[PDB]
Amino acid sequence: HHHMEQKISVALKEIKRGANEIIGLEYIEKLVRKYYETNERFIVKAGFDPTAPDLHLGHTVLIQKLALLQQYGARVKFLIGDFTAMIGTRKPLNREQVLENAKTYEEQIYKILDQKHTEVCFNSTWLDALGAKGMIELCAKFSVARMLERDDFAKRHKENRPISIVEFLYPLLQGYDSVAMGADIELGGNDQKFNLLVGRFLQRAYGLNKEQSIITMPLLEGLDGVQKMSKSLGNYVGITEEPNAMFGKIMSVSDDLMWRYYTLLSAKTLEEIEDLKHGILNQTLHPKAVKEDLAGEIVARYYDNDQAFKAKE
Amino acid sequence: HHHMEQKISVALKEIKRGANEIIGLEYIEKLVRKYYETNERFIVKAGFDPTAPDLHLGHTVLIQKLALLQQYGARVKFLIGDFTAMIGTRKPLNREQVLENAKTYEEQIYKILDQKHTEVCFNSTWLDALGAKGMIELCAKFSVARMLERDDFAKRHKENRPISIVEFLYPLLQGYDSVAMGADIELGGNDQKFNLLVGRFLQRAYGLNKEQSIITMPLLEGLDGVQKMSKSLGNYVGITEEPNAMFGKIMSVSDDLMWRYYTLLSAKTLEEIEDLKHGILNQTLHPKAVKEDLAGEIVARYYDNDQAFKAKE
């Protein structure tokens, strides 16, 4: 079926776009074809900081990949990890704060995600029910040696530096979340690979018929282009910043950084971006109007089209 | 107070009698004096196999030290570890089996212990209530490096052999039992030192005003005198064996083994035993009558005096 093969080939390229690494692309391909064949959605898991929802564009990179995956049949489980947050620089949160912060996330994430195929989850739902016995059964499934292979543990173990045994529980609990949620894909940051792999190993160990694929996303470069975007470093673009200011901040970036932001932030397709790089070189497009198109797209995402024209002017 | 000092000095020698090692003898001394001064009892913890109560004399060695400690003010907490037994050669037990086995223990242990100052406990009582959050808080109190110093873990870690993370939980749970029970002394076998030390460390970490002393007891020699007593090795003396047979089994032992059994099994005092070794050498006592006195004492412990005379004849 030549037409479908083209559609699938394109879907796979968009899914890989901007990622650092994908484990399990074949399973992802099988789920995308099933979605096209049957309309059956598959489950995509991504975990978010219950404490800090003051967001800049760097925080949205993973959310943009989640929105892309919804185009190809993903049902998104936006997981707030309140269980560890309510236990405890890291003082413990109460339930009312957890709900307030989730509400805060929801003031924005549906400007990126398709709300109809998104579900906000709290892992305290199943983790409160785990019990001491559930914890025991979880810990029986994972070895000490594998655990000491996570990068920070190996260095601290080698350097004779303290590792608390509770630090062994957190990756197991994150992996268990994938078990309880039946995740088919889990997204995380590039430093999170080991932890994303735990859920994939634990799904097999708990007798599920499947193991989640995983995608790692890089950190977004700041407007400078050499430090990762950080409210600390003063190189961020706040999602709530006023349009004219947000538009001007994006104008600061170099031309090379513009394409990087295109890869990771823009709704334009790989093919459409390829045309932009062609016309700028064929002198059919000016790069300023391309940087303006990008700035306008980000302002229109968090506001609207009309307010995005005024920021340019 | 010269009289009391003599009483305390003797109490300490009887408490050390037969032990491999005592950690915290000063605290034990303070509790014994307080008992003599105020009649206030202190808490002695010892843990027992929920699954196997078919008992020989080797199983009673620790129980005899518990009975001795009751003479000096111990209130004994006979702890059945049903929490791990009901999770699971090691198939899981159900509640009815746990209660049946505890009943089986109670058909015998009060032939050794003072039932009035004994309490049978099940650690599922507080461990069911721990929750996943309690497990997390427990594991935050102990380091990975200290845990890998237990002898079997160090060898397996060095030999690149599998250690399951759940194996890190069991000593922490045993230590937590000491926290929940407020133990002042914990008894165990010589191989158990590391685990006994966990409770003593965890009591401090949970903010208790104290840390349990610990006593380790050796394994009893079999009737042969070179292998530890074992139902497997066929060198055991069953606590339920018929008197005449039980009496004759004890007669098998060598003279050197007789004194060892005196140290670990006999209600006679250190001073009284010293007199027995003197009269056998001064030829005022025959060693056969000494071995008979011991055999009779063990038969009378698990039966009665009258039935203990008939076994000799």
Q: What is the DSSP string of A252-292?
A: TS-HHHHHHHHHHH--S-HHHHHHHHHHHHTTSS-HHHHHH
DSSP assignment of A129-173: TTHHHHHHHHHTTSBHHHHTTSHHHHHHHHTT---BTHHHHHHHH
Q: H or E segment at B146? A: helix B144-147
Residue A132 has its nearest CB partner, among B127, B145, B164, at: B127
Asked if B90 has any chain A CB less than 8 Å from its own CB, the reply is no
Phi, psi values for residue B145, rounded to 5°: -60, -45
CA-nearest residue to A147 within chain B is: B165
Residue A140 has its nearest CB partner, among B133, B142, B164, at: B164
Give the Cα separation of A305 and A292 in Å (integer).
13
Cβ atoms of residues A32 and A73 within 8 Å: yes
Q: How far is CA B251 from CA B60, B120, B233, in A?
A: 19, 34, 18
Asked if B180 has any chain A CB less than 8 Å from its own CB, the reply is no
Q: Do A130 and B132 touch (CB under 8 A)?
A: yes
Cβ atoms of residues A151 and A195 within 8 Å: no
Q: How far is CA B205 from CA B45, B141, B180, in A?
A: 19, 7, 13
Burial of A187 (0-12, 13-18, 19+ CB in 10 A): buried
Q: How many CB atoms lie within 10 A of CB B21?
A: 12
Helix, strand, coil percent content, chain A, rounded in steps of 5 = 55, 10, 30
- The method recorded for this entry reads X-ray
Cβ atoms of residues B57 and B236 within 8 Å: yes
Please tell me the distance in Å from B185's CA to the nearest CA on chain A.
26
- The contacts found for B198-202 with CB under 8 angstroms, 24 or more apart, are B198/B142, B198/B171, B198/B172, B198/B174, B199/B45, B199/B174, B199/B175, B200/B23, B200/B24, B200/B175, B201/B142, B201/B175, B202/B138, B202/B141, B202/B142, B202/B172, B202/B175, B202/B176, B202/B178
Q: Do A142 and B135 touch (CB under 8 A)?
A: no
Indicate the pairing of strand B185-189 with strand A42-48.
unpaired
**Which of A1, A14, A139 lies closest to A70 in space, CA to CA?**
A14
Indicate the pairing of strand B42-48 with strand B74-80.
parallel
Q: Vertex B236, ends B234 and B242: CA angle to 5°?
A: 110
Q: How many CB atoms lie within 10 A of CB B39?
A: 8
Q: Which residues contact A232 (CB under 8 A, 6 or more apart)?
A: none
Task: Please report where in the chains the tokens 């009665």 appear, as a residue.
Answer: B304
Q: H or E segment at B145? A: helix B144-147
Give the Cα separation of B228 and B219 in Å (integer).
6
Give the Cα separation of A211 and A22 in Å (integer).
13
Q: Do B145 and A131 touch (CB under 8 A)?
A: no
Give the Cα separation of B73 and B310 in Å (integer).
35
Q: Taking CB atoms and an 8 Å cutoff, what residues of chain A touch B135?
A: 132, 135, 169
B193 is annotated as contributing to ligand binding: no
Please tell me the distance in Å from A139's CA to the nearest CA on chain B.
5
Conformation bin of residue B172: beta by default, left when phi > 0, alpha when psi is -120 to 50: alpha
Please tell me the distance in Å from B306's CA to the nearest CA on chain A.
50
CA-nearest residue to B172 within chain A is: A165
Cβ atoms of residues B86 and B92 within 8 Å: yes
Give the Cα separation of B295 and B285 in Å (integer).
16
Per the DSSP assignment, residues forming a β-bridge with B76 are: B44, B118
Give the Cα separation of A123 and A79 in Å (integer).
7
One-letter amino acid identity for B171? P
Please tell me the distance in Å from A57's CA to the nearest CA on chain B.
34
Give the Cα separation of B303 and B306 in Å (integer).
9
Residue B139 has its nearest CB partner, among A130, A143, A165, at: A165
Q: How many CB atoms lie within 10 A of CB B65?
A: 24
Q: Taking CB atoms and an 8 Å cutoff, what residues of chain A touch B205?
A: none
Give the Cα separation of B98 and B105 in Å (integer).
11
Q: Taking CB atoms and an 8 Å cutoff, what residues of chain B touch A142?
A: 164-165
Q: Taking CB atoms and an 8 Å cutoff, what residues of chain B touch A160?
A: 145
One-letter amino acid identity for B244? N
Phi, psi values for residue B120, rounded to 5°: -90, 125
Q: How far is CA A112 from CA A59, A100, A224, A310, in A?
A: 12, 20, 25, 22
Q: What count of CB pairs under 8 Å joins A to B?
A: 94
Asked if B157 has any chain A CB less than 8 Å from its own CB, the reply is yes
Give the Cα separation of B111 and B239 in Å (integer).
10
Residue B132 has its nearest CB partner, among A131, A148, A163, at: A131
Half-sphere exposure of B289 (CA within 13 A, CB side): 8
Residue A165 has its nearest CB partner, among B87, B130, B168, at: B168
**Which of B195, B196, B172 lies closest to B186 in space, CA to CA?**
B196
DSSP assignment of B183-246: -SEEEEEGGGHHHHHHHHHHHHHTT-S---EEEEEPPPBPTTSSSB--TTTT---BTTS-HHHH
Give the Cα separation of B168 and A283 in Å (integer).
66
Considering all CA atoms of chain B, what is the largest pairwise distance in Å, rounded to the nearest integer? Answer: 67
* Resolution of the model in angstroms: 2.2
Name the DSSP class of A77: E
**Which of B112, B162, B4, B43 lies closest to A148 in space, CA to CA?**
B162
Residue B169 has its nearest CB partner, among A136, A141, A160, at: A136
One-letter amino acid identity for B136? I
Burial of B256 (0-12, 13-18, 19+ CB in 10 A): exposed
Asked if A144 has any chain B CB less than 8 Å from its own CB, the reply is yes
Angle of the A131-139 helix axis to the A166-181 helix axis, nearest 10: 100
Q: Could you tell me the two tokens for B111?
A: 């032939």
CB environment A127-147: b (16+ within 10 A), e (fewer):
beebbbbbbbbbbebbebeeb
Q: How many CB atoms lie within 10 A of CB B89?
A: 4
Q: Do A168 and B139 touch (CB under 8 A)?
A: yes
Cβ atoms of residues B82 and B50 within 8 Å: yes
**Which of A40, A44, A42, A120 lies closest to A76 in space, CA to CA?**
A44
Best mutation target, A136, A153, A159, A172, to test chain B (most B CBs within 10 A): A136
Cβ atoms of residues B214 and B228 within 8 Å: no
CA-nearest residue to A135 within chain B is: B132
Q: Taking CB atoms and an 8 Å cutoff, what residues of chain B touch A164?
A: 139-144
Conformation bin of residue A219: beta by default, left when phi > 0, alpha when psi is -120 to 50: beta
One-letter amino acid identity for A105? Y
**Which of A50, A20, A62 lies closest to A229 in space, CA to CA?**
A62
Asked if A136 has any chain B CB less than 8 Å from its own CB, the reply is yes
Give the Cα separation of B47 and A247 in Å (integer).
70
How many whole angstroms from its chain centre is CA B205? 25
Give the Cα separation of A75 and A34 in Å (integer).
14
Q: Strand, helix or coil at A207?
A: coil
- List the end-to-end C-alpha distance of chain B, in Å, as a whole number: 48
Considering all CA atoms of chain A, what is the largest pairwise distance in Å, rounded to the nearest integer? Answer: 67
Cβ atoms of residues A141 and A206 within 8 Å: yes
CB environment A188-199: b (16+ within 10 A), e (fewer):
beeebbbbbbbb
Asked if B201 has any chain A CB less than 8 Å from its own CB, the reply is no
Q: Do B163 and A145 touch (CB under 8 A)?
A: yes
Q: How far is CA B98 from CA A1, A280, B77, B145, in A?
A: 64, 79, 17, 35
Q: How far is CA A161 from CA A112, A157, A277, B159, B204, in A?
A: 42, 6, 50, 22, 22
**Which of A22, A30, A308, A300 lies closest to A188 in space, CA to CA?**
A22
How many whole angstroms from its chain centre is CA B170? 19
Q: Vertex B153, ends B152 and B154: CA angle to 5°?
A: 95
Half-sphere exposure of A244 (CA within 13 A, CB side): 2
Third-level CATH fold of B2-217: Rossmann fold (3.40.50)
Q: H or E segment at B43? A: strand B42-48
Q: Strand, helix or coil at B107?
A: coil
Q: Taking CB atoms and an 8 Å cutoff, what residues of chain B touch A81?
A: none
**Which of A46, A125, A137 lies closest to A83 in space, CA to CA?**
A125
